[PDB]
Design a protein around this nucleic acid. Structure first.
Ligand SMILES: [Mg+2]
Ligand SMILES: [Mg+2]
Ligand SMILES: [Mg+2]
Ligand SMILES: [Mg+2]
Length: 1341
RNA sequence: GACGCAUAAAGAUGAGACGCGUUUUAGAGCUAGAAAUAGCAAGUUAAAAUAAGGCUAGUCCGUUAUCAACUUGAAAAAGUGGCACCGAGUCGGUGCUU
DNA sequence: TTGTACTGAAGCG
DNA sequence: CTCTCGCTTCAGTACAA
DNA sequence: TCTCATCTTTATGCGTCAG
């Protein structure tokens, strides 16, 4: 009658088991459909479902964003062509048509094969005159001669297409604020304002600073040594205040007009001219030098004065490359002529031919040429250029991502200012072209859709087409920026129909502090027992303490209030240790800004303050903050307004305004905050207030409050989890359906939840500030002295990593700066192409170019050699972990490899936690569907959440050991053990049922005590319990309920039953059959080949001319039974085989299958015998061999090896020989057990041999591994067991893979023939596999 | 087993952008050559595409979830499969039942 | 002319 | 006043019929 | 890889949800 269901939810697996009250698993004769002769099969109610992962959406977002960027770039080019078209019609009416036709072969081209001029001599004259586009760009900016309009369009289209980045927002005018000369007019301006007119000697310019690196410790000493120091922090010339601003907002030093805070001159300095701009020169010239140092950092030098330093530097690279190429060729032909063919012709050995024509990247070319370079003579300058990575450089390079768009804009403005006299239409629409280059869609606007995108939120004032010139007249920036946030912030969970408060909201802070405060309790010598703080006390301490310190300590709560006001000798307190968890931080911010305490303490003006804080949270864009805030300008002075608009906030609370201050109790009239301020002597907190039935909040919340697919579709987060949710809920539903719709007595879920010692918990959850502090004092730096910081800004990951690395890059020996992390790179050690891992152990803050060059690799052996000492210096200083040092040093151990792809990855754990939590909620909501007027829910089925630790301990303590490498049955056995342990546990201790059952509750560090209890609770299974003192204690071999005489656990029959179930051969393993989504092919384009297999990259682009893709992903296979017109003497041969349908043909095939099959050559197709076959389709063959359909032309291992449990226990015990960590008598017990049962190894090998001969058929691998075993038989038991544990890779279900046994590696046998399953028996397995439909394919055709 | 707060890890989801990479063409290769070729010279850049494409034609969308078989239903979605016992190499056997 | 067996390929910071 | 988490299919080239 | 915001699940400290 009664039955229980146990569940184990892995990220890729759902173990399931059904048990009775006797801990026995039922077995039933299930009906089997299909045309086969089998009508009934006996199966056991235990199994697991295996499925491929749920994939995250973010890759699809990346493709979406790349698609959008390409479309918008094409539209920019189209806009420029639309502007130039009418003038282009005058000189060459087919110019854009030849540019559009550049990709076609000359036979396909409608016009002449030369795109630019249409004739060969002018084209070769162009390339001789301008070797690169940069030469043409420089000629257009610098010269004044009327040039051809085609060249003008080519330069502007090149520079618009590759416009550089927008991470600089200012003007950065690369035309006067640029020449290193600027120091001279700076020192004159300094002599003109500073009336003493000091020394203006011919000292060396900022090139002296830039000779090594831009830093404090060298700039300051160089300028002070060059020109004698009259004022160290007030030199008023080329200061660090005028180069790289200070970390804090510290006041001006030796001020001229006023003492005002200082920062860097990017975007937070334009109001620190309040010394003069608020009271009405060197700051302007300073800005111009700051610009000069940025652009001389990002571009090297122009010796002759040009408006285009970029093009000049690129031509400098070209000329250097040409000279060094000529020198290299001459020296190579001189000293080693035999290498000349390899270096300069063979493009496959990473030579110069491989560096240009081949695929070798710049670092590979350098490391190839370097030994050849050093063995040669006269190569000192080539080698020092190689060491600077400045040898034979290209122009188009990964380094160019450093370049801000302002440089390209400056060049465009200069070119247009040159050529506007010769072409009036350039002067007519110069601003339109500048807008085409400069315009960027704001991130808060999103896509520019018209009601046809699920991703778009932008609203528009008019229906006109959006152009960069009319963007502000059409797009309603306001509502769109608000809709960027409000669509995305979650609703209040108690009031589902309105949004939560901002985190920094004053009302939210008030609620938070009064909620914490109202269950503070205090006691003192006159008391009988502790009291709560009355409302007047709570108000007085809020006024005198919280409003006067940004945080409060219980120590000052004593020594400030209780000693002075209502004086006590002592008071003892509970509800708080040390720091209060709440504070009025925003109140202190607003007090510091408005400087009106009475305004903030005023009651009637709270709503406008909440409107302000809401505004300052929602909006980032300064003009939008201004516009929204402007309404309140008749209470605030313009100064304090222009200040307050800086005070950005972010993040959101959990509650609506109406919950905490909107709803009122009908009889009291008080809000929740009103009760928290004063509730007499009850002082009820929030939870009490929403669950006390006396107040009228409870039924108001109740009044504030179907398909399964809707129930999973509404909830947010990763789409990945929804797969798992649907799978296991469908499993549970079909298990209920199998046994005649009878509901379980309970469902047991293995939650991935734990408990641990309080000390360990706090030791983990420490503030990262303490970590930074103790590491930096351990390594003895002074970074905190010069750069001070507290915890909350380390929540930013770049600044955290900057303090983690002690202000210095560990790839390159240079100091880092704190103000310029914008262009600095976060870097993952392991490539994101290889393995998703976003732990701090895998993250680097490094200079951009170094990470860019570290494409697809761990840091290479050379940077390891350069930096391993500093890496060790940070390792022993507790700033990086051993995993971080091992990852950093990974190149010395061979770099990444297949065995580095092993070990379970962090995300799987978070996924299983999320998945199981949701599963538990949906199963409780679905199963308990009935309720009464007095009973709010009827516990028809108790969902019981076991912690993993309990079942894992039960496994070890009774030697039901588990390993994974042998078979997938471990999932099913874990589910069965969860069912057993949970059912026995709740049977033994009914008074603990309210702990484990979902939705129920009962009412030295607390976690410590709970963990110790969570150990002791399991003891009732044991026969003998060893206490902490080392003395044994007995326990009856029959267990009873205690309050009842009902037996709960017999240490006889029940252990035998468990061992019998664990040793059962028949376990249901079902791989979910899935039809493939995702990308059409592998993404790489492949060269022109006469091969038919090349997928056409475009409709007209025949890939036999143009190249194409390869490896088209098969969406699914289809069985076809038809005639294929075979032979020279043509005749119709009837034949049956699988066709693969690729994703590209999925929609075309499903539109009309018969016509698509006739397009493939099949005729007389039997339409009704077309079978849809997903991946992993299951086929049953002779002798009991099972083959899994991996693809239209590949099979997979479909059987599973049911090894006896004694061998599994012996294998687990033989490995991990000295790492059990129990007690010594136990380890020696297992040592004589494994020594006396050594022959089990041979028995296991015999089993593996039979099973391999039965279903694997890889006989060549079989005899190879048998010879390897017979060679290595005399090795110690440890390595033999370990390598045999590897050996089971031969026999697992699914994909063949390589494995190695001791010294020797075995390659997989590949089942590359799907002909042989065409006469097998196809199996349609249900979600559990208990329901089957076996079809015989030999009877078809 | 839930909720608010602080302190933690480890992860998600959407938008705006940058630089590379690859492909085809353009950038006249020269000499000795019956030549299969051999010697020499040169190589740095540009145009275009970047899931085929789709229609509501937007400077939008097209790689994330949804998926055993059969019977209904456009689809959504609904429905379809006896029990007890003795045993165990991927499940077998025995006995009642319509 | 068609199956095998073996080695190699794969968009990224 | 209630407790005792997982791992590949296709592209090529070279031989057996 | 850069810039923007938004969540989610587990760990520990505080408080609380019932009869
Ligand atoms: Mg588990
Ligand atoms: Mg998927
Ligand atoms: Mg990296
Ligand atoms: Mg499992």
């Amino acid at each position: 009658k009664k039955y229980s269901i146990g569940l184990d939810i892995g990220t890729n697996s759902v173990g399931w088991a059904v048990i009775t009250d006797e801990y026995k698993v039922p077995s039933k004769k299930f009906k089997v459909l299909g045309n086969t002769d089998r009508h009934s099969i006996k199966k056991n109610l235990i199994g697991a479902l295996l499925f491929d992962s749920g994939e995250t959406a973010e890759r699809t977002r990346l493709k979406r964003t790349a698609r959008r960027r390409y479309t918008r770039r094409k539209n920019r080019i189209c806009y420029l062509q639309e502007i130039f078209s009418n003038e282009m019609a005058k000189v060459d009416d087919s110019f854009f048509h030849r540019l559009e036709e550049s990709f076609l072969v000359e036979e396909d081209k409608k016009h002449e094969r030369h795109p630019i001029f249409g004739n060969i001599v002018d084209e070769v004259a162009y390339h001789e005159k301008y070797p690169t586009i940069y030469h043409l760009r420089k000629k257009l900016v610098d010269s004044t001669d009327k040039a051809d309009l085609r060249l003008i369009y080519l330069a502007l289209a090149h520079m618009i297409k590759f416009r550089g980045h927008f991470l600089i927002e200012g003007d950065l005018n690369p035309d006067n604020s640029d020449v290193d000369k600027l120091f001279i007019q700076l020192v004159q301006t300094y002599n003109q304002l500073f009336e003493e007119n000091p020394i203006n000697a011919s000292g060396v310019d900022a090139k002296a600073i830039l000779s090594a690196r831009l830093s404090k410790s060298r700039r300051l000493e160089n300028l002070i040594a060059q020109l004698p120091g009259e004022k160290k922090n007030g030199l008023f010339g080329n200061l660090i205040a005028l180069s790289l601003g200070l970390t804090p907002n510290f006041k001006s030093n030796f001020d001229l007009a006023e003492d005002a805070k200082l920062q860097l001159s990017k975007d937070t300095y334009d109001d620190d001219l309040d010394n003069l701009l608020a009271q009405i020169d060197l700051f302007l010239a300073a800005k111009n030098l700051s610009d000069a140092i940025l652009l001389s950092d990002i571009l090297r030098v122009n010796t002759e004065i040009t408006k285009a330093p970029l093009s000049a530097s690129m031509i400098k690279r070209y000329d250097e490359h040409h000279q060094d190429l000529t020198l290299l060729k001459a020296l190579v032909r001189q000293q080693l002529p035999e290498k000349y063919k390899e270096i300069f012709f063979d493009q496959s050995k990473n030579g110069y031919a491989g560096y240009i024509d081949g695929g070798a990247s710049q670092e590979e070319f350098y490391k190839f040429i370097k030994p050849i370079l050093e063995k040669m003579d006269g190569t000192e300058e080539l080698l020092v250029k190689l060491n600077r990575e400045d040898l034979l450089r290209k122009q188009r390079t990964f380094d160019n991502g450093s370049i801000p768009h302002q440089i390209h804009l400056g060049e465009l403005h200069a070119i247009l200012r040159r050529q506007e006299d010769f072409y009036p239409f350039l002067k007519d629409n110069r601003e339109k072209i500048e807008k085409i280059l400069t315009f960027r869609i704001p991130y808060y606007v999103g896509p520019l859709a018209r009601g046809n995108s699920r991703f778009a939120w932008m609203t528009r004032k008019s229906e006109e087409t959006i152009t960069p010139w009319n963007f502000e007249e059409v797009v309603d920036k306001g509502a769109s920026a608000q809709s960027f946030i409000e669509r995305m912030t979650n609703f209040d969970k108690n009031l589902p129909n309105e949004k939560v408060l901002p985190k920094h909201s004053l009302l939210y802070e008030y609620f938070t502090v009064y909620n914490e405060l109202t269950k503070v309790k205090y006691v003192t010598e006159g008391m009988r027992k502790p009291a709560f703080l009355s409302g007047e006390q709570k108000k007085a301490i809020v006024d005198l303490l919280f409003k006067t310190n940004r945080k409060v300590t219980v120590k000052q709560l004593k020594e400030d209030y209780f000693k002075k006001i209502e004086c006590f000798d002592s008071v003892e307190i509970s509800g708080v240790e040390d720091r209060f968890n709440a504070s009025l931080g925003t109140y202190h911010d607003l007090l510091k800004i408005i400087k009106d305490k009475d305004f903030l303490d005023n009651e009637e003006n709270e709503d406008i303050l909440e409107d302000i804080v809401l505004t300052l949270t929602l909006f980032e864009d300064r003009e939008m903050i201004e516009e929204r805030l402007k309404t309140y300008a008749h209470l605030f002075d313009d100064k304090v307004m222009k200040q307050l608009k800086r005070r950005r906030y972010t993040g959101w609370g959990r509650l609506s305004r109406k919950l905490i201050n909107g709803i009122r109790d009908k009889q009291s009239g008080k809000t929740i905050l009103d009760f928290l301020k004063s509730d007499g002597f009850a002082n009820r907190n929030f939870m009490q207030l929403i669950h006390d039935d006396s107040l009228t909040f409870k039924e108001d919340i109740q009044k504030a409050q179907d398909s399964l697919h809707e129930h999973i579709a509404n909830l947010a987060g990763s789409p990945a989890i929804k797969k798992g949710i649907l799978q296991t809920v469908k499993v549970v539903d079909e298990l209920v359906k199998v046994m005649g719709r009878h509901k379980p007595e309970n469902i047991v879920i293995e939650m991935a939840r734990e408990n641990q010692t309080t000390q360990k918990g706090q030791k983990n959850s420490r503030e990262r500030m303490k970590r930074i502090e103790e590491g930096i004092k351990e390594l003895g730096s002074q970074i905190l002295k010069e750069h001070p910081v507290e915890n909350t800004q380390l929540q930013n990951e770049k600044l955290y990593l900057y303090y983690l690395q002690n202000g210095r890059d560990m790839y390159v020996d240079q100091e880092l700066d704190i103000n310029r992390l914008s262009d600095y790179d976060v870097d993952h050690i392991v490539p994101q192409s290889f393995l998703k891992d976003d732990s701090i152990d895998n993250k680097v803050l490094t200079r951009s170019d170094k990470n860019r060059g570290k494409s697809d690799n761990v840091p290479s052996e050379e940077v390891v050699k350069k930096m391993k000492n500093y890496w060790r210096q940070l390792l022993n200083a507790k700033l990086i972990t051993q995993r971080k040092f091992d990852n950093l040093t990974k190149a010395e151990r061979g770099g990444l490899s297949e065995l580095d792809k092993a070990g379970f990855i962090k995300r799987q754990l978070v996924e299983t936690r999320q998945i199981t939590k949701h599963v538990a909620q949906i199963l409780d909501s679905r199963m308990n569907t009935k309720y009464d007027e007095n009973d709010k829910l009827i516990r028809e089925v108790k969902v019981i959440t076991l912690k993993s630790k309990l079942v894992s301990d039960f496994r070890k303590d009774f030697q039901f050991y588990k390993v994974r490498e042998i078979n997938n049955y471990h999932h099913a056995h874990d589910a069965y053990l969860n069912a057993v342990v949970g059912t026995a546990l709740i049977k033994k201790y009914p008074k603990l049922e309210s702990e484990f059952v979902y939705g129920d509750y009962k009412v030295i560090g607390k976690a410590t005590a709970k963990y110790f209890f969570y150990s002791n609770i399991m003891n009732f299974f044991k026969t003998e319990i060893t206490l902490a003192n080392g003395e044994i204690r007995k326990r009856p071999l029959i267990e009873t309920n205690g309050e009842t005489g009902e037996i709960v656990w017999d240490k006889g029959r029940d252990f035998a039953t468990v061992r019998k179930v664990l040793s059962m051969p028949q376990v249901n393993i079902v791989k979910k059959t899935e039809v493939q989504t995702g990308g059409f092919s592998k993404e790489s384009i492949r060269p022109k080949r006469n091969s038919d297999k090349l997928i056409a990259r475009k409709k007209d682009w025949d890939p036999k001319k143009y190249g194409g893709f390869l490896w088209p992903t098969v969406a699914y296979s289809v069985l076809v039974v038809a005639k294929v017109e075979k032979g020279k003497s043509k005749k119709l041969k009837s034949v049956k085989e699988l066709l693969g349908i690729t994703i590209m043909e999925r929609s075309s095939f499903e539109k009309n299958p018969i016509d698509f099959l006739e397009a493939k050559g099949y005729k007389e197709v039997k339409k009704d015998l077309i079978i849809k076959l997903p991946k992993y389709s299951l086929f049953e063959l002779e002798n009991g061999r099972k083959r899994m359909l991996a693809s239209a032309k590949q099979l997979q291992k479909g059987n599973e090896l049911a090894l006896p449990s004694k061998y599994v226990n012996f294998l687990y015990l033989a490995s991990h020989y000295e790492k059990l960590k129990g007690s010594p008598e136990d380890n020696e017990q297992k040592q004589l057990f494994v020594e006396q049962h050594k022959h089990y190894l041979d028995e296991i090998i015999e089993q593996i041999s039979e099973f391999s001969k039965r279903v694997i058929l890889a006989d060549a691998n079989l005899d190879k591994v048998l010879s390897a075993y017979n060679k290595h038989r005399d090795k110690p038991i440890r390595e033999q067991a370990e390598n045999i544990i590897h050996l089971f890779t031969l026999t697992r279900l699914g994909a063949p893979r390589a494995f190695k046994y001791f010294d020797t590696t075995i390659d997989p046998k590949q089942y590359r023939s799907t002909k042989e399953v065409l006469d097998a028996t196809l199996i349609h397995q249900s979600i559990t596999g208990l329901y089957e439909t076996r079809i015989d394919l030999s009877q078809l055709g």
